[PDB]
From a paper:
[name] ([name]) plays a key role in anti-viral defenses by inducing a potent immune response against double-stranded RNAs (dsRNAs) produced by viral infection. Previous crystallographic studies show that RNA ligand binds to the extracellular domains of [name] and induces the formation of a homodimer of TLR326. The charge interaction with the phosphate backbone of the RNA double helix plays the principal role in the interaction. The ligand-binding site involves both the N and C-terminal parts of the [name] ectodomain.
To determine the structure of the [name]-dsRNA complex, we mixed purified full-length [name] with a poly(I:C) dsRNA. The length of the poly(I:C) used in the experiments ranged from 200 bp to 1,500 bp, with an average length of ~400 bp. The raw micrographs showed that a vast majority of TLRs are linearly assembled along the RNA strands with regular spacing. The final reconstituted three-dimensional structure shows a 2.8 Å resolution image of the [name] tetramers on the RNA strands. The cryo-EM map resolution was estimated to be 2.8 Å, but the RNA region between the [name] dimeric units has structural flexibility that prohibited refinement to a higher resolution. However, when the refinement was focused on the dimeric area of the cluster, a 2.3 Å resolution could be achieved. In the structure, the RNA double helix is bent by ~8 degrees at the junction between the two [name] dimeric units. Our cryo-EM structure of [name] is practically identical to the reported crystal structure with a Cα root mean square deviation (r.m.s.d.) of 0.77 Å. This result demonstrates that linear clustering does not disturb the structure of the dimeric unit of the [name]-dsRNA complex. The dimeric units of [name] are repeated 2~20 times with a regular spacing of 103 Å or 34 RNA base pairs in the cluster.
Numbering used by the authors:
A (entry chain C): 29 to 696
B (entry chain D): 558 to 696
Write the structure that this text describes.
């Protein structure tokens, strides 16, 4: 039971409260134990506890005197117990409680007044009980209560009198989810002084009972309303009529299997700002279906439409100008849908749209022509996501309508083509382009000549072709900072591929075939493609088949901090190859063929490191191979994980399998 | 491989083997050709080729073998015609290849590309040097 300021006793098999703890302990966690009871005498020593989490135990009942020994108790958690009965004296002395959690206690009913005495209580949780009513008292108490959780009970109706005890309470959260409520008596929500949030998830209401509830919620202070999985199959223009008399800001209608939304179904919500409609079954979206929602800023439509059906091929249909009402919309999410395509006025009217996600939103979007995004011309779009749409071809001026765009994600598609460079015309403010995991991309001289402001370019797993053009395709990218070219099986690179890219910081080249370029027998000499990269910080050259490293390939990389060279075939390294790496913090050389670690090579590299990774190597445990290295290991602050297990000698056979760190250098 | 008394040719090349159980070849008395190249073999148990009294061709190229010792290769190297252990990281030390280099010095078995592809790997003093040029006068 480790404890310095908070005491935790989780899964300690404790049957009684330990009596050997610091006196000044304020938090005592006793969850998942076998505490049968909580006698006050065992808590006499602890007179300064603030939070006592005793849930998930076998407490059947408590005593009022327990709160006498804890005058400063604030949070009391009795989750998952069997306190089926409560008394008016049970919580009388606990006058400073803020949170009282009584979930899953098999409480059947509340008799007279178990919560009258406490006045500073903020949240009361009574979920997963057997309660059949909201009756918690007779007089008016719980003045400062803000959250009332009553989920997963047996409550079947709401009555005004049952809630009358909350006349002076401003309920910020009223959770009634998973209770089969079938009747909302008039004035039931007007009993609460101020109700700000109501949750009715997993409560089978239906359109008619929804209309009754909305009429019952009128002229209240409600701001958040959640009706997820409420069996709301259809909506009409009279469904939320009562909500005309409130200032609702958030509405949740997800998982309702909603099929048809009538025109002006939400015209009663002029102040709505957050709308959630994910995971529904909408067949057709009409022009006036979203009419009257001009204050909405966030709309979620993920998985909101009917899926592909092989019986009738009834793809969901979105009428044109169906979003023209959303003048203040800024964030639109439409992922995981089966929309056939993008029409000429799909997004017309969205004059404040800044984020649009269309990841996996379409079934047949193969070609991105110059008319695809014309409806987004007047939107100030900054981020566009188009992943997983099986896009195959991008034509010229495809994104010419997006002049303010900064992030464009086109990965996880089937784009196989040659980048002529005309696809990026009009992208005057672009910063990031993601193209990883496509069919094949072939570069040319002017592939990126039209986007000089680019800063991040990801080209992983695209089977890059012609990256070795005599004028480098990356030459115009003077502001480029992150470049990813991994897993492309690239074999040939010219020495001026990265010339002029003084701002480059991250370069990923792992899982290519660049081994031949660094061999001294390569015709014309080794290729020095890392020159001039003064600001480079992260270099990844893992799994390229390298056998040898030219001595002067890292000479210009003064600010380099992380270099990864594992999974290569490196055995012998030239001396003074890491001389200029004066700021190196992480070196990775695992799963190579390295046998000796010597000062003339690794001296400057091992100067001030944080992490070292040279695990699966055939170390030759000899006084001229690892003596300096093992002495360095003996005294060093660099973190070397799995040092005692995966750093094993290979030769001589006397040392085969022995740990490198246990090599004895006393006779060197 | 048990019970195969009349087996003559065995090919186990490129199976990813790391270790060989000591008693896998015990019943193969008439075995003449065994191919174990392109595996990941480094350490072999002693007396693993004891019963191969008629072995004529042994192939162990492109493995991870570092030491060739009498307790393993003694009976195997008795009367051979061909030996193939070319691309291996030989540890040129007096306890790793001294018996092997002495055996190479006087033997009638044909060892092609002995002077070029049998190169030391460790210690770094010997890295790249031919195995056959190892000096055992100070062993
Ligand atoms: C007391 O400790 C328990 C166990 O660590 C906390 O209960 C849950 O523990 C699981 C497993 O670590 C977490 O996944 C949950 O998130 C924890 N519950 C919550 C609500 O976060 C318990 O919360 C701790 N109690 C206090 C007062 O810190
Ligand atoms: C575009 O949307 C996709 C899908 O929602 C995002 O992909 C997720 O990215 C996060 C963070 O990288 C990962 O943890 C998830 O696993 C990804 N999901 C899938 C299905 O791959 C992607 O990040 C978005 N792109 C941008 C630029 O926001
Ligand atoms: C608390 O409720 C009582 C009874 O309705 C009322 O008289 C009193 O003014 C309320 N307190 C406040 C601060 O409104
Ligand atoms: C809300 O109050 C207004 C103004 O008093 C009233 O006209 C309307 O009928 C009320 N709504 C309901 C559902 O009673
Ligand atoms: C209302 O909903 C929004 C969005 O889900 C949330 O951020 C906010 O906290 C909610 N209001 C209250 C009072 O909890
Ligand atoms: C709802 O729409 C119908 C169909 O046009 C219309 O007759 C009715 O008046 C509308 N309801 C309200 C409350 O306006
Ligand atoms: C109203 O809805 C019906 C069917 O839901 C649709 O045919 C009609 O066009 C809609 N009204 C307008 C003005 O679009
Ligand atoms: C799109 O390209 C076609 C073919 O070049 C051209 O005829 C058409 O005018 C272009 N569209 C726009 C809006 O420029
Ligand atoms: C590159 O960044 C610098 C500094 O922010 C800026 O002056 C320059 O305009 C940028 N280049 C382009 C083409 O946006």
């Amino acid at each position: 039971t480790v404890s310095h300021e908070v005491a935790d006793c989780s899964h300690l098999k404790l049957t009684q409260v330990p009596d050997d703890l610091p006196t000044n302990i304020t938090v005592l966690n006793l969850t998942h134990n076998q505490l049968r009871r909580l006698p006050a005498a065992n808590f006499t020593r602890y007179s300064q506890l603030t939070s006592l989490d005793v849930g998930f135990n076998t407490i059947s009942k408590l005593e009022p005197e327990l709160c006498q020994k804890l005058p400063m108790l604030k949070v009391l958690n009795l989750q998952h117990n069997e306190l089926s009965q409560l008394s008016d004296k049970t919580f009388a002395f606990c006058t400073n409680l803020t949170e009282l959690h009584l979930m899953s206690n098999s409480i059947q009913k509340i008799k007279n007044n178990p919560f009258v005495k406490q006045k500073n209580l903020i949240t009361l949780d009574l979920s997963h009980n057997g309660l059949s009513s909201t009756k918690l008292g007779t007089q008016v108490q719980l003045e400062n209560l803000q959250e009332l959780l009553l989920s997963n009970n047996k409550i079947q109706a709401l009555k005004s009198e049952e809630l009358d005890i909350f006349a002076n309470s401003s309920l910020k959260k009223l959770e009634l989810s998973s209770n089969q409520i079938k009747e909302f008596s008039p004035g039931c929500f007007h009993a609460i002084g101020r109700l700000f949030g109501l949750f009715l998830n997993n409560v089978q209401l239906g359109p008619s009972l929804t209309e009754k509830l909305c009429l019952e919620l009128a002229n209240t202070s409600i701001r958040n309303l959640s009706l997820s999985n409420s069996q709301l199959s259809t909506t009409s223009n009279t469904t939320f009529l009562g909500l005309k008399w409130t200032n609702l800001t958030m509405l949740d209608l997800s998982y309702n299997n909603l099929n048809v939304v009538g025109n002006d179904s939400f015209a009663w919500l002029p102040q709505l700002e957050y709308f959630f409609l994910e995971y529904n079954n909408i067949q057709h979206l009409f022009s006036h279906s979203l009419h009257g929602l001009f204050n909405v800023r966030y709309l979620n439509l993920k998985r909101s439409f009917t899926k592909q059906s092989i019986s009738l091929a009834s793809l969901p249909k979105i009428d044109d100008f169906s979003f023209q009402w959303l003048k203040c919309l800024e964030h639109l999410n439409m992922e995981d849908n089966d929309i056939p395509g993008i029409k000429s006025n799909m997004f017309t009217g969205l004059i404040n749209l800044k984020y649009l996600s269309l990841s996996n939103s379409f079934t047949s979007l193969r070609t991105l022509t110059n008319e695809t995004f014309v409806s987004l011309a007047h939107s100030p779009l900054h981020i566009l996501n188009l992943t997983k749409n099986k896009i195959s071809k991008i034509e010229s001026d495809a994104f010419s309508w997006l002049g303010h765009l900064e992030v464009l994600d086109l990965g996880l598609n089937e784009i196989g083509q040659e980048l002529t460079g005309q696809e990026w015309r009009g992208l005057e403010n672009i910063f990031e382009i993601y193209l990883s995991y496509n069919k094949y991309l072939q570069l040319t001289r002017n592939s990126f000549a039209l986007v000089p402001s680019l800063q991040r370019l990801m080209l992983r797993r695209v089977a890059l072709k012609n990256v070795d053009s005599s004028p480098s395709p990356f030459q115009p990218l003077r502001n480029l900072t992150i470049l990813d070219l991994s897993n492309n099986n690239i074999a040939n690179i010219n020495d001026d591929m990265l010339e002029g890219l003084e701002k480059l910081e991250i370069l990923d080249l792992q899982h290519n075939n660049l081994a031949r370029l660094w061999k001294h027998a390569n015709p014309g000499g080794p290729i020095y493609f890392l020159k001039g990269l003064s600001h480079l910080h992260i270099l990844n050259l893992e799994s390229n088949g390298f056998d040898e490293i030219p001595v002067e390939v890292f000479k210009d990389l003064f600010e380099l901090k992380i270099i990864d060279l594992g999974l290569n075939n490196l055995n012998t390294l030239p001396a003074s190859v890491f001389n200029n790496q004066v700021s190196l913090k992480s070196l990775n050389l695992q799963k190579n063929l390295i046998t000796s670690v010597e000062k003339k090579v690794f001296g400057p590299a091992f100067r001030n490191l944080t992490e070292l990774d040279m695990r699966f190597n055939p170390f030759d445990c000899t006084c001229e191979s690892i003596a300096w290295f093992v002495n360095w290991i003996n005294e060093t602050h660099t973190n070397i994980p799995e040092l005692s297990s995966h750093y094993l000698c290979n030769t001589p056979p006397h040392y085969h399998g022995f740990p490198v760190r246990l090599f004895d250098t006393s006779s060197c």
